[PDB]
Amino acid sequence: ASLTEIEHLVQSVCKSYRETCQLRLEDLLRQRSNIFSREEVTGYQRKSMWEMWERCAHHLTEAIQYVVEFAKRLSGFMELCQNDQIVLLKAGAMEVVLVRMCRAYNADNRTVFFEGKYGGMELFRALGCSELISSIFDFSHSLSALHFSEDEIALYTALVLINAHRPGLQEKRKVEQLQYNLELAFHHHLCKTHRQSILAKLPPKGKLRSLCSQHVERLQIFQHLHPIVVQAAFPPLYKELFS
C-alpha cells in the first residue's frame, strides 16, 4: 500500500458519500430559521401514535435507501459475497443514518430537520418513545460538538458499515482487510488535516449499538399494540431490517 493508494481511497470514499448524501449540507443549514411553530408542534403531538410511527418509519426508510446506495458505490463492498453485503447492511444501515443525522441537527436550539422544518424532541411525543428520542438527540448533540466536515462523515460512516466483527460474516478476513484499508484512509486524512484530536472523542461502538437496540425494542412494543398497522402500513424494507 502506497500513500498515493491510500489517498485514492480517501477521495473515492468521499465521492461515494457526496453522491449518496441525500440532502446537501448547505440546504440543511439554509433551513435552520425555518422552525415549526407552537401550533404545528401541537399538531404533531395530537396525531395518533401509529400515524406518527408510520411517518417516522417512512423517513428512516428513505434515509436507509441512500445508505444502501452509499454501500453499493463504496470501494470493495460489492466485491464481498451477497451474504456479507446483507449482514453488513442489516447491522450497519441504521447506525449510518444515525451518524448522518447530526448534519440535520442544530445544536444551538436542539432541533432536528423533520418534514421540511426544524423541531425539538417535543415534536415526537406522540410516539411514546421518550427515552429513545432523547437518546437520539443526545447522540446527535455529542456528534455536533465535534464539528464534522463532510469528508470526515464520509470516512467515519464507511467504517461504521465495514465492520468485520458483525456476526454472520462468511468472509471475515476479506472484511477485515477492507476495514483496515478504510481505517488507514480515515486516519491518514485526519493526520493530513490536523484533526487526529477527534479520535478520542468519537463515541464508543456501544453508544450506536444501544440506539439501534432501543429502536428495535420500541418497535417490538409498538408492533404488539398495532400488528395490522405494521403489516399493512410500514415500509417493506423497514420490516425486513427491524422486525
Binding site: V68, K72, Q82, Q85, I86, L237
Partner: peptide
Amino acid sequence: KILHRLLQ
C-alpha cells in the same frame, strides 16, 4: 428480499 433487489 427488498435488500436483495436494491443490491442488483
